[PDB]
Amino acid sequence: IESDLERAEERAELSEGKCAELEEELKTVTNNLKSLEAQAEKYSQKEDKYEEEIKVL
Amino acid sequence: IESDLERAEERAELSEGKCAELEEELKTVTNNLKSLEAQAEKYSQKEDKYEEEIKVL
Amino acid sequence: GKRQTEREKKKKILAERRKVLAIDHLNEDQLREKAKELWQSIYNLEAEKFDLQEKFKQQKYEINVLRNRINDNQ
Amino acid sequence: ISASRKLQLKTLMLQIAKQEMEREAEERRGEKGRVLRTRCQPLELDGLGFEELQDLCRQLHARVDKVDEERYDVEAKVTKNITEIADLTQKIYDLRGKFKRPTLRRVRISADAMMQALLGTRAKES
Amino acid sequence: TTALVCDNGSGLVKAGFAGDDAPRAVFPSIVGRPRHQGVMVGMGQKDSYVGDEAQSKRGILTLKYPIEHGIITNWDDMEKIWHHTFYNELRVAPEEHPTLLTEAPLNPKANREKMTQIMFETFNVPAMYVAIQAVLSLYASGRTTGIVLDSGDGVTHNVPIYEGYALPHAIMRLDLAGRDLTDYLMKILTERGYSFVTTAEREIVRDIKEKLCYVALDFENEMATAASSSSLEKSYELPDGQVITIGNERFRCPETLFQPSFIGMESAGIHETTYNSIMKCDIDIRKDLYANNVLSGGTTMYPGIADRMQKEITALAPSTMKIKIIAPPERKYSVWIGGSILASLSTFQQMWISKQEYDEAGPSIVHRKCF
Amino acid sequence: TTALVCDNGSGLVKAGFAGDDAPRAVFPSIVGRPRHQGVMVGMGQKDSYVGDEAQSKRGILTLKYPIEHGIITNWDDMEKIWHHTFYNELRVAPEEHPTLLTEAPLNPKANREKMTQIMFETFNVPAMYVAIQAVLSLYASGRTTGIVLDSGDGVTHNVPIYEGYALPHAIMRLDLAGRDLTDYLMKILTERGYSFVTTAEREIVRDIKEKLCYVALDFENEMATAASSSSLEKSYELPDGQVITIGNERFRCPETLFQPSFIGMESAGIHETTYNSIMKCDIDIRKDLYANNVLSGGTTMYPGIADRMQKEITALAPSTMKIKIIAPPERKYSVWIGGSILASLSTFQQMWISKQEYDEAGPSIVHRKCF
Amino acid sequence: DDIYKAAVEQLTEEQKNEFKAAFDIFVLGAEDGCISTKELGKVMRMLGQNPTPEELQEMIDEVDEDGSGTVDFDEFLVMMVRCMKDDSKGKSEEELSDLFRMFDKNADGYIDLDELKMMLQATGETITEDDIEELMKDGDKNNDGRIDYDEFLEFMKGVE
Ligand SMILES: Nc1ncnc2c1ncn2[C@@H]1O[C@H](COP(=O)(O)OP(=O)(O)O)[C@@H](O)[C@H]1O
Ligand SMILES: Nc1ncnc2c1ncn2[C@@H]1O[C@H](COP(=O)(O)OP(=O)(O)O)[C@@H](O)[C@H]1O
Ligand SMILES: [Ca+2]
Ligand SMILES: [Ca+2]
Ligand SMILES: [Ca+2]
Ligand SMILES: [Mg+2]
Ligand SMILES: [Mg+2]
């Protein structure tokens, strides 16, 4: 039973490590998505401004 | 020892489930990020053309 | 000076492996004798070289075997 | 095959492996002798006057120096390999030694020796 | 055969065969002798654990980096690191492989000459070539112009390049980098009660810096917010328990990059040395350099730096120019990816310093045409 | 030839040839001169009965231990004990056998030097080596790390070890041990009417302590329970009849280990000196020491101590770390089993202090490289 | 010991009758018929010495296919040959290493299955596919199918 307990412990440790890595990856990619969405909104506004400038000039 | 082994194995199962869910989230967010990268590239091309026309005018 | 030691070691490799050659005082007959001795020396040297190459190959093979044993145990 | 039979099976496996190792060593020595003979070619001794012999001896000395330096290089390679294999075998010992201490017992006398010490000259088989 | 693209760096040695996407073996460059006495016999205790092995036994070692600021201060340890890298992390004898080391700009000559002498005498490589760490990072981006800010762990240097013609008079090398940020973080953590002193605990502070710190978009507003609310305090679990809570130390550690007066350095931040490096260039290539600013190196991985730097440069630069900051996700290994690309080129195949050339001119060959 | 693994100890001398599982001869270390006059002529009465012989004639002797607290206070008696051990309990002349004594940490130098001088001059051994009593107990567990609490009968010491490198600045030696528990039990038995005074009756009190006392999991609850019910009162038959009944003296005697204020000692219990010994270690090896806490020595054989100690340390330690207490069933002879293992090693075979070395440097050789 | 186990497995009259005579003599206290733990200990003690019982228990339970405290036939001979160490673990580490390195025909430090079976065909001894699977499982300490030098030495223990 002691050997069985050791095996269970090591499996749990590996699973937790993978979980932590996945958490970090998701955090990074979600931050990237947020930044890109803000940039896209600003870009739409800039595009409208540029079209207005084209018309007036 | 037997009780501790049972608890450890249950913990490992829970961690594996969490890892699977994290994998799903990561893949979904990755796809969304790629789509928005393409959108931003289109934004960039539009801005380039508008800038050129502004210069000409 | 460890670097000084290395440089003097390679200089001694280039110098001591060079021997003092004396064949111009050895007359035509003794010149033939010296040529035979030099050929024997160079042939023995090449035999030693080949044996060292083969032993190095086998030692590298045993190194690979022991490292693979370590990897299987680790 | 029984336990003793499979022990003899693996023993014959070791025997065939020893045959292969011996033939490998023999062919290795023969082919290396062949290669050296292709390298170590005896030259003609008679018919040459003094000057040609002197030039040939100079060339032989240059080749001796070159091959001696090469032999030094290969000897250094061999020494490095010896050091590395020694370290690897020591790590092998560390991985599966040290804590492999057997139960050294001075009261478990050999079955024949124990029977003799407890009975005189009775035990003679083992 | 294939070339070995090694990259000494300072803090992480990255190596691998030419032509791949990522380095094969990445491990810290530390060599730590044991410091206690040792009572168990036959335990097989070595005299120096190098590489990633000494990051697991660091509890009883005294880790010491062999590369201080780009330059190499302890040649025996560096030789040991190279020997480990070749034989145990890649398992390829160097007698059959060209090598491509990397070196920071404006480094002492003796360092480079000793490096080539070691590679040719001890390891006995067929041919080695030394390249500037910024040109490779420009290769990896697939550009051919642009000004690259390669903020490593040892030294931050800023090499501008146009159309493939490097501008040697506009290289601005600054010695603030990740290590000084680690020391400053370790110094400001003492304001809450946590004292890290041992050279082993510097690694723990480095992990804290990597996982928690971020660069603030606006410094004063963040300082005001962290002093009123408590939405920033993130906790972290030490290697033994006793979780710690980092408050406004989070964005104060990497702020040193933009205000080197925090650690007493006189010079201007990485936001202003880039603008100065641009302004030293000619008047007709400033637009292209403005539009193709490249980030590289490990220390430029802080969350939120690609926006702070753009805001700062836009403040400094003329209002008409467009400021764009290229921050690829593979920033850390950008130099090594560029090194692999350069070593895989056919046009580059005749630039190696062949061994016979070294035998004829000595170690001073590196400063000659074969740069 | 084979080595003699002697282990002086304080209270029980354990000896035997190297390479076995258990010591060959285990007997109390007491030397008792007769005290009465003696009228029978020719009875063959000796002048001093040592070892296990004086535990049978103890009715007319005055037993006195030659080892007080690890240190040796009466060298003639200790020499007599060693002579008995070699010649009558093992029957092997010392002229043909190496010896491996054991010594507590932080003991006076003069004790060790006198020990080696005796072994080399009087008994004239070929070579002897002195080892710290805790490293052996760590050998016997088959570990290579861990912090071992070796609560003998003379002195309790707590040596932490990591990866084979002992930490000399973290050894916490405390002088409370089995003998003080015997004296305290003999002192609290007087609260029911039983008075033991003679040095012979100390042995009877020791037997009571061994057979009846146990360590309570929670002290206050046990004190409350023993004061209401009567389910704890266990009786015991003296060497002459007149059974006695021990009430709450059962768990109050060994409780002194965790509260040394009972016998007036200032220091903290064995539950808190282990935690202090851990906290003096480096921050990166505390998890391993937490997980590999080892118990040894005779006094750690009380029924229920491996749970009380774990509960106490878990209360003190951070909540995340796992606390595990290794308590092998062969606790009493753990030091000697480890000594046998160490003496049986091939790597250790050249560490003995050879006699010619002693002849060249004198008894002060033991402090030198041959430790 | 290497010859002792094999000979005594199919022993002739002489030493088997020696064992039977010893059993018949043992009736001075031990009469179980089949040697149990306590009767074995009593017999060993009445011989005139008191060995550590650990050796006896490892003789009587470890190597057995039952390990119930009784004595079987082949394991009695295992005990007899375990008093000394004459079966030399299946040759010596040097010879074994040479045969393994030549066995490692692809020179990768491990024995693959295909070249292993080809060499087994080259052996030419009596073939038992069940024994072949037994050796395969003996070479699975790390359960890779391959036999490295560790497990190679492990199942070569006593190969004479
Ligand atoms: N994800 C990260 N976040 C913040 N800082 C990091 C991160 N990864 C690495 N660093 C810092 O960068 C350093 C590694 O830089 P690196 O690019 O490896 O230097 P080099 O140029 O010598 O290879 C580390 O010391 C660390 O302080
Ligand atoms: N079974 C037991 N239960 C409780 N205490 C014991 C037991 N056996 C021994 N002791 C105590 O331990 C002491 C023996 O300790 P020991 O380990 O022999 O000391 P040393 O380290 O000097 O050999 C005895 O004096 C006794 O008080
Ligand atoms: Ca059985
Ligand atoms: Ca193979
Ligand atoms: Ca296998
Ligand atoms: Mg770099
Ligand atoms: Mg003791």
Which structural traits does this protein have?
part of a larger assembly; 7 chains; C: 74 residues; mainly alpha; 2 helices; 82% helix; G: 160 residues; 9 helices; binds adenosine-5'-diphosphate; binds calcium ion; binds magnesium ion; Actin_CS (chains E, F); microfilament motor activity (chains E, F); Actin, alpha cardiac muscle 1 (chains E, F); hydrolase activity (chains E, F); oxidation (chains E, F)
Describe the structure in brief.
Chain D has helices at 3-39, 50-95, 111-119. Chain D has 126 residues and is mostly helical. The two termini of chain E are 22 Å apart.
Number of strands of chain G: 0
Please report the number of helical segments of chain C.
2
Largest protein-protein interface: C-D, 42 and 43 residues
Proportion of helical residues of chain C: over 70%
Helix- and strand-based class of chain C? mainly alpha
Sequence of secondary-structure elements of chain G:
HHHHHHHHH
Distance between the termini of chain C: 40 Å
Largest sheet of chain C: none
The oligomeric state of the chains shown is part of a larger assembly
Helix content of chain G: 55-70%
User: Could you tell me the radius of gyration of chain G in angstroms?
Assistant: 20 Å
Order of helices and strands of chain C: HH
Question: DSSP strand (E) fraction of chain C?
Answer: under 5%
**Overall spatial form of chain C:** elongated
Main beta-sheet strand count, sense and barrel state of chain G: none
> Total strand count of chain C, please?
0
Small ligands present: adenosine-5'-diphosphate, calcium ion, magnesium ion
Overall 3D shape of chain G: elongated
Content of β-strand of chain G = under 5%
Distance between the termini of chain G: 10 Å
Blueprint of the fold:
The structure is cut from a larger assembly and holds 2 copies of chain A (57 residues), 1 copy of chain C (74 residues), 1 copy of chain D (126 residues), 2 copies of chain E (371 residues) and 1 copy of chain G (160 residues).
Chain A: H1 2-56
Chain C: H1 2-16, H2 28-73
Chain D: H1 3-39, H2 50-95, H3 111-119
Bound molecules: adenosine-5'-diphosphate (2 copies), calcium ion (3 copies) and magnesium ion (2 copies).
One magnesium ion binds at residues 9, 133, 150, 152, 297, 335 of chain F.
Give a verbal description of the structure.
- The structure is cut from a larger assembly and holds 2 copies of chain A (57 residues), 1 copy of chain C (74 residues), 1 copy of chain D (126 residues), 2 copies of chain E (371 residues) and 1 copy of chain G (160 residues).
- Chain A has 57 residues and is an all-alpha fold.
- Chain A is 96% helix and 0% strand.
- Chain D is mainly α.
- Chain D starts with a helix and ends in a 7-residue tail after the last helix.
- In chain E, helix 4 packs across helix 5 (201-212) and helix 8 crosses helix 10 (305-316).
- Chain E has helices at 75-90, 109-121, 133-140, 178-188, 201-212, 219-226, 249-252, 270-279, 286-291, 305-316, 334-343, 355-361, and strands spanning 13-15, 25-27, 31-34, 49-50, 61-64, 99-103, 127-132, 146-151, 156-162, 165-166, 172-174, 234-238, 241-246, 293-296, 325-326, 353-354.
- Among the domains of chain E are: 4-137 and 333-360, ATPase, nucleotide binding domain (Nucleotidyltransferase, domain 5, 2-Layer Sandwich); 178-256, ATPase, substrate binding domain, subdomain 4 (Actin, Chain A, domain 4).
- Chain E is of the alpha+beta class and 371 residues long.
- Chain E contains 12 helices and 16 strands.
- The C-D interface holds C 13-14, 17-19, 21, 23-24, 27-28, 31-32, 34-36, 38-39, 41-43, 45-56, 59-60, 62-63, 66-67, 69-70, 73-74 and D 28, 32, 35-36, 39-40, 42-43, 45-46, 48-50, 53-54, 56-58, 60-61, 63-65, 67-72, 74-75, 77-78, 81-82, 84-85, 88-89, 91-92, 95-96.
- One calcium ion binds next to loops of chain G.
- It is classed as motor protein.
- Keywords: tropomyosin, motor protein.
- The entry is titled "Structure of native murine cardiac thin filament variant I79N in troponin T at pCa=5.8 in Ca2+-bound partially activated state (lower strand)".
- Chains A, B: Tropomyosin alpha-1 chain.
- Organism of A, B: Mus musculus.
